Amino acid sequence: SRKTYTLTDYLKNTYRLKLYSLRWISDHEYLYKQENNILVFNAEYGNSSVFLENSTFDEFGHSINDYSISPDGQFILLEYNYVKQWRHSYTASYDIYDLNKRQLITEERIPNNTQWVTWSPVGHKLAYVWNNDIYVKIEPNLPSYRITWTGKEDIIYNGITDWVYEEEVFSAYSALWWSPNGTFLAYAQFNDTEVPLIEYSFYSDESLQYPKTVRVPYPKAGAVNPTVKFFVVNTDSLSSVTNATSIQITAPASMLIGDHYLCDVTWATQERISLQWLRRIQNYSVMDICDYDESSGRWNCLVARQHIEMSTTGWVGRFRPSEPHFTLDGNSFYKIISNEEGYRHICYFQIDKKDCTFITKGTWEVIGIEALTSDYLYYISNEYKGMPGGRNLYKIQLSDYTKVTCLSCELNPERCQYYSVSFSKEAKYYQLRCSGPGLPLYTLHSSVNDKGLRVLEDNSALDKMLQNVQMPSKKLDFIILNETKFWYQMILPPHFDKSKKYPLLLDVYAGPCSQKADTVFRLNWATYLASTENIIVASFDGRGSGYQGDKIMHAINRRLGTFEVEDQIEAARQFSKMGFVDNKRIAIWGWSYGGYVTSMVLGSGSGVFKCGIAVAPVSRWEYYDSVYTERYMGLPTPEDNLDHYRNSTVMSRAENFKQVEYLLIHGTADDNVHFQQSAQISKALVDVGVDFQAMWYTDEDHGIASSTAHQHIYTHMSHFIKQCFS
Amino acid sequence: SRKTYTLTDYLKNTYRLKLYSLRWISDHEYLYKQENNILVFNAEYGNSSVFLENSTFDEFGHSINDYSISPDGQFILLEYNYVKQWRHSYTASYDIYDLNKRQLITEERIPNNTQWVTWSPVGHKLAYVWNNDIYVKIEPNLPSYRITWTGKEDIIYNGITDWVYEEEVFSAYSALWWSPNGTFLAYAQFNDTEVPLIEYSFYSDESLQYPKTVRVPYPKAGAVNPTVKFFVVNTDSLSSVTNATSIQITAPASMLIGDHYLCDVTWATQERISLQWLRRIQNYSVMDICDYDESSGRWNCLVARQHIEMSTTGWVGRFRPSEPHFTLDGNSFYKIISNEEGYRHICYFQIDKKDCTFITKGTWEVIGIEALTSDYLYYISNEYKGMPGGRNLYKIQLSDYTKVTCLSCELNPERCQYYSVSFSKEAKYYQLRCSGPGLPLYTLHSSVNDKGLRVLEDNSALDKMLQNVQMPSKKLDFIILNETKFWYQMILPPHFDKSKKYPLLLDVYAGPCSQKADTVFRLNWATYLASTENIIVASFDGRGSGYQGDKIMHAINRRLGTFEVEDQIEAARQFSKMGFVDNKRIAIWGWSYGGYVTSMVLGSGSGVFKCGIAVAPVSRWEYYDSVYTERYMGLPTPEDNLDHYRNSTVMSRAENFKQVEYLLIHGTADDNVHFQQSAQISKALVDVGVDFQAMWYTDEDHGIASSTAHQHIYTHMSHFIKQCFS
Numbered sequence A, B: 001s002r003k004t005y006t007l008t009d010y011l012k013n014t015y016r017l018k019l020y021s022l023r024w025i026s027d028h029e030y031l032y033k034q035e036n037n038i039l040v041f042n043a044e045y046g047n048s049s050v051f052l053e054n055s056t057f058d059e060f061g062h063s064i065n066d067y068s069i070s071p072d073g074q075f076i077l078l079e080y081n082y083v084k085q086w087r088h089s090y091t092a093s094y095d096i097y098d099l100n101k102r103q104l105i106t107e108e109r110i111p112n113n114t115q116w117v118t119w120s121p122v123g124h125k126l127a128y129v130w131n132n133d134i135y136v137k138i139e140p141n142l143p144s145y146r147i148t149w150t151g152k153e154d155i156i157y158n159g160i161t162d163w164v165y166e167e168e169v170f171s172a173y174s175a176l177w178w179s180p181n182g183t184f185l186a187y188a189q190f191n192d193t194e195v196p197l198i199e200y201s202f203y204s205d206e207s208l209q210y211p212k213t214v215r216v217p218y219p220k221a222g223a224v225n226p227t228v229k230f231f232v233v234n235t236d237s238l239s240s241v242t243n244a245t246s247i248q249i250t251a252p253a254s255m256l257i258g259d260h261y262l263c264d265v266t267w268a269t270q271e272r273i274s275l276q277w278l279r280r281i282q283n284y285s286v287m288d289i290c291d292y293d294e295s296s297g298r299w300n301c302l303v304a305r306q307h308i309e310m311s312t313t314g315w316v317g318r319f320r321p322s323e324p325h326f327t328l329d330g331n332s333f334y335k336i337i338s339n340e341e342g343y344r345h346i347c348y349f350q351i352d353k354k355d356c357t358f359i360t361k362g363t364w365e366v367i368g369i370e371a372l373t374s375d376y377l378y379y380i381s382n383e384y385k386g387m388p389g390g391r392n393l394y395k396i397q398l399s400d401y402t403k404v405t406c407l408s409c410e411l412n413p414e415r416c417q418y419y420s421v422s423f424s425k426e427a428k429y430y431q432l433r434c435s436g437p438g439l440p441l442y443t444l445h446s447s448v449n450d451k452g453l454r455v456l457e458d459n460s461a462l463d464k465m466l467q468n469v470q471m472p473s474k475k476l477d478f479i480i481l482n483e484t485k486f487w488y489q490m491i492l493p494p495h496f497d498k499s500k501k502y503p504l505l506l507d508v509y510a511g512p513c514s515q516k517a518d519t520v521f522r523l524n525w526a527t528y529l530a531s532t533e534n535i536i537v538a539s540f541d542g543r544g545s546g547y548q549g550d551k552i553m554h555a556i557n558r559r560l561g562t563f564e565v566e567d568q569i570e571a572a573r574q575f576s577k578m579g580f581v582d583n584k585r586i587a588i589w590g591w592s593y594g595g596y597v598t599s600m601v602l603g604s605g606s607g608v609f610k611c612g613i614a615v616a617p618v619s620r621w622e623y624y625d626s627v628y629t630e631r632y633m634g635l636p637t638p639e640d641n642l643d644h645y646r647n648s649t650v651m652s653r654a655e656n657f658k659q660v661e662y663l664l665i666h667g668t669a670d671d672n673v674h675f676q677q678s679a680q681i682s683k684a685l686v687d688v689g690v691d692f693q694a695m696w697y698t699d700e701d702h703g704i705a706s707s708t709a710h711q712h713i714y715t716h717m718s719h720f721i722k723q724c725f726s
């Protein structure tokens, strides 16, 4: 009777998880693919018309993957030649197709090898970066206009984020920001002139005779940072002036004093724009609100309009200060910030009234400000049931702060405790995402009544297919320590016997403001081991975890590589004295930050573990970029915290590895955690004379994405864990 | 009773092998260290005086490792700051000490960071290369003279060999050649301008933040070769002319036609110099003999003086055409060359009489022309007992070629069958090196009587220390195949039972003109496994082995990666049907070329093996340098043998790896077999979905020399073999 979730049922991915990714084109209309054609749904009654045919693109000669329709619904952009670079950066070519005249444009097209292109919020104005310069077309068929000329590769990035501004701050490539009615366009430029490079080898296919040395700007902690500058241009007169005039916003003076960054820039009104500027020591940021001048033509920022935002126990925000959310008029806004008790709640500011008013309280951080009508503010947070990995949607009335209504609570909390959401334009309709504990369920809701229309995807298909197979189970809970409760979880095998000795495996990522303890239902490697192998996977959230207040998340400021690693072991301890946790067989594995921790853990004399696996792990903080590292360690100099970068290195513990069975794995083309860190980890043990299992993956970046490598790694880990155990 | 040669007794090296490395300063005097001081021995009676004190160098402030005394015995050069680069290249600083006035020189010293320095054969003239230029000092304290100014790093090498000219042709760095009476000096220059580079990462100690990208000129097979040029200068008038005039020798025309090299240049007389020039297709070389002109001042080469030397079945020579050996006058010489039957015997040439006369015959190649008095010619060869790995010294009389006397035959062939030798100047005394089968024995002999004076080192110390431990044993022999006998050998365990099933391990290097079957007595990793683990190590010489005629060595010309790999397995077969060779447990491991073979072997469908280990193995010949590769494969183009580079790639066999248990190991800073080859080997299996054991060694060059890495690797191999077996 029945089999289990094997490696193959995993790797080859037999059990599919149907989504329903849609994009609203208005306030009551969105677009949803259907494999062949692309239907256009009507938010309300759902009278699904067919927007664009599928066969209308066979004879294209190219392999097309993405599309982008302007507001006008008059042009579809076609993406192909996708060449991943970093996390979100990609270089490809695009073709514009005129929807109305049912014909494909031909002359004055977007250059091949572009870097980013986009529609403006309204109107089909196309802005784009190519060869590191910003060109803009008012009309598709018409020529174009170069807003910059200074653009010099791997030096001056116009309209696009360099390496570090991508991964750590914006988590995107798009360094341009269109204005509400497509009248203004604001970009961000970076002089990487003195920014240091990190070279390495790429080997391509067996045919390449001489390897290629990839050099890319990358400020490893304490090094030089690419100086930034912000501008704005009038996309209207640029067509009839010759050289489009590009006015620059500078300051804040509180930022000019030294090394600065650029947190999150967002418009408020057609002539009002708010820019958040962070300091290198990320405890002090300042938000600026500048408007447009009809006389002077310059963007002025009346000093009595800024909102200084500081932190006495660390950095500012979760991974950057959250984006403001202005009201319609544009003189009032809402930004999720750290409060007194250290919980992140929607403070309501005024463009001149310095202070604010938190329109929420308690011991439950708020996740994000989704929608904002001059009636309700639909946000997400971990309040219901009290748990941190519990995502829900609440709609607080802007007039009375007692009027706070949950919407995703009782939809079926027997199957849902984790959400996120997609709204229409005027937010007259929203699409909820139930991603756990049970199977994901996407559903539609009308806003004026907050009533549930219908079910867009119930996964009943996948579901019936899991009754034929003995799946595991997820016990998510908390343990008490130092008077505070910390959250962990266990992917328990089927037919769980709490009286027999089992082998444990700690799956730890646990990096600052993370969360390894949530109701999220995933069918990953954890799911295989738990079922087929009978190895209990477990993740613990300790003294650094986010979404649980600042007292928990900030307790690692500057002490990175101490508590979040101790707590892990202290956790491993708490499990030992639980019965089924067969002391003589406990494991710990981690990827990325997870590998780093899993590295400090092994070299602790803990002896709690028999073996361990670290994938692309950090091992000395000078080896990672500053915008992330400096935020949790200050500067690597004796005047700051250099003493600790040196204490928290996987290398100094190399000696205590003699007991364990370490297994290092690393992409030899990792843009993120440079192979370097792992090149020193090995050489560490080689010098201390300690055998260990090495395994490199050629050309593989930080995620060891490639189909083959992916299937490969998780295989080599299965052979390992099911050795060190069964 | 007794233990065995464990890993530790190996790695930590407990059992030492006393040598007796000496250097003759004349015809009856040499220098031999004594740890503290440095004694000077008298070749004859042996009345050992003490040359230089040890304490005379305490207060040196530096760490000194080497010394070099001029002929004059008037100056000692002191080496320190040794920075290994490649195989023989090294960069360090040197201090000259005046022996007579017992004082150290101070001003006008050798610049720090020099690249090579040397005494002339007579007189204390110092020639040296620094920053890629050739300077020469007549006197130590006096200034110096720059013979070149074109010297530009990683482009123009004056007085020093680039990467490829070091490893494959000269096996040295010294690209200058002093003339007999220090009157002339001849250098070799290299325009590496178009020579391609091979970059890679070096990571240094944990402190380096940004890795360093090592770029070095290196012509991988079929690429561009660094064009060479040869000169000569008058070290006498250079002191009194200003710019020392540097006359160039060009041609041969047979060489100007296309891509050429420079085999081996050697003087004959104060005004006679012979230069050997090879073609890119290494089957055709030409030796030139040019003299000095008193009128014209130019070095002329009367065409009727050259000695064309071609090969119809391969390249010319063993790894380069052997060096000529002229007679005193300088009009007659001896060069070991391939003869009719294809055996390398001392042909005797005349500077004008085109042909020659072989003063030796038979089925035993000659190793080398050691000494040459106008009486006898003391060479080495594998004639005695008929075996190939049998080295001995013979002294054939120049007047009668029947007068051929062995000297190292009966000294105790119960303990000796392998030699090599060090002669005095006028060869009035020679020091023999018995390196196998039993313990090494160094001894002295007088030449005028060829009588054995005394024993310089008998190893009786080490010896007595091997009676307390059960050492293995070495059965060296041959097997018959295709009517020809091929040589193999077995490092058999103690108390060998030829009736019980044992596990075998093929230790194969077997590359062109190599020898894995010889009477050499070594205490390496093989010795550990054989004893303690009871795994029978074995090496086989097949269809490519040298020292056994051309019919055996040349049978792989252009077919590299076919017979020498087949024969290996065919050999593995011959062992299987021998009893103790437990079929269900046979291994094969190889380093460098050895790993390559051991790679082709695994992917053969042979099924003969259960597992295998390859260290820094070649895996596609485009990945190695041309001067070595082109010699055994011609050029990688369809007009030559490109078709076969592609057949002989470890990658195409990636599929047949599913059965075996491959284990790849490779230095990540290998100047020789670039990590590249192994980066493709892995990616090969990753794509065919085949689990394998990877293990890289950071910064380690081709030999994984470093104490720690060395101990490490051989450990990781012991865990493996003693798993795949015991």
Ligand SMILES: CC(C)[C@@H](Nc1ccc(CNC(=O)[C@H]2SCCN2C(=O)C[C@H](N)Cc2cc(F)c(F)cc2F)cc1)C(=O)O
Pocket: A167, A168, A169, A171, A319, A509, A511, A591, A592, A593, A617, A618, A624, A628, A672, A673, A702, A703
């Ligand atoms: C291991 C795998 C499953 C997957 N893990 C992973 C874990 C968490 C997240 C969520 N990201 C965020 O919330 C935001 S906000 C600013 C950018 N955020 C980031 O996390 C950027 C960091 N550079 C991520 C990172 C940190 C390290 F310390 C490190 F050594 C390597 C790294 F890649 C994404 C990925 C992965 O790493 O690709």
Ligand SMILES: CC(C)[C@@H](Nc1ccc(CNC(=O)[C@H]2SCCN2C(=O)C[C@H](N)Cc2cc(F)c(F)cc2F)cc1)C(=O)O
Pocket: B167, B168, B169, B171, B319, B509, B511, B591, B592, B593, B594, B617, B618, B628, B672, B673, B702, B703
């Ligand atoms: C494996 C270890 C013990 C040891 N093996 C090794 C084997 C043989 C020799 C002796 N060399 C000679 O007689 C002459 S003459 C012209 C230069 N000769 C050479 O052999 C030059 C070749 N380039 C050597 C070589 C290197 C490689 F990396 C490779 F894959 C293949 C190769 F052939 C030295 C070392 C080692 O290579 O480090």
